[model samples]
Target: SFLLPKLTSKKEVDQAIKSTAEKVLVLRFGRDEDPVCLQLDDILSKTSSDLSKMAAIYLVDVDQTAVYTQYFDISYIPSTVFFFNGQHMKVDYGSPDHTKFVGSFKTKQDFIDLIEVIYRGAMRGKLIVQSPIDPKNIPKY
Candidate 1:
């Protein structure tokens, strides 16, 4: 079966890349699926549509007759990669539970009962900013 978010051209893929931030949760799925893969795609699509500004969702075919998959070092389908500086810091092969996937976001915590996997790691210098903490009143814990 063809995936819902099947990437058609390099331009679409490039747009996704340019729009993705350092704290990105990328969901990669092939044209077919096992049960877990299906679930992953469903949850990812829902979340991506909801939090459209925070992350990028791309559907890639591992068996595509092109060099894109090889260029991206994609050896498996249903993989989720957390990218920073255009490099993957965390990647999971096969399907991961919804809880594991949605836990990576900052807001919309009550929307789903998933463990948030906060993407914490070194990032590109262009992505960093210093936010000052209030000395008088501490941030609510």
Candidate 2:
């Protein structure tokens, strides 16, 4: 099953972000039933173990965590946010949204590459990193 740990409350989300030291903490904010969320979850699940060394990926159901959804200003389905050492990390995906990734990635490699770049940049004290994916592969809002 490609389902990472699902966070059901704000407390858990906080714990995830705070306890995940020295690794990228990925939180997918969306419903499990949504098609795009399902696709993203599938990829995250498939790659979760492989990325364990560099990232800690978790799923946040917007239906459950209204406070977080609002706090993060997540207006899109399956929005993905990254954090490292308790600090928010952003990626310039050539989109209007820089706070969180707006949609599902095109492929597993695309996601892995993105995470790797983020991990590298975050370790270097960079809050934002350029997207390694081609613009064509990035989902348009």
- Of the candidates shown, which would achieve the greatest lDDT relative to the real structure? 2
Q: Write the per-residue lDDT of candidate 1 for residues 72-101, one digit (tens) a residue.
A: 454444444444446444322122321122
- Give the Cα-based TM-score of candidate 1 against the true structure: 0.49
- Residue 27 local lDDT, model 2: 92
Q: What tens-digit string does per-residue lDDT give for candidate 2 at 42-87? A: 8899988899999999989788878888988988888899999999
Supply the global lDDT for candidate 1.
Answer: 0.44
Candidate 2: TM-score? 0.96
TM-score of each: 0.49, 0.96
| Off by more than 4 A, model 2 | none
lDDT of each: 0.44, 0.90
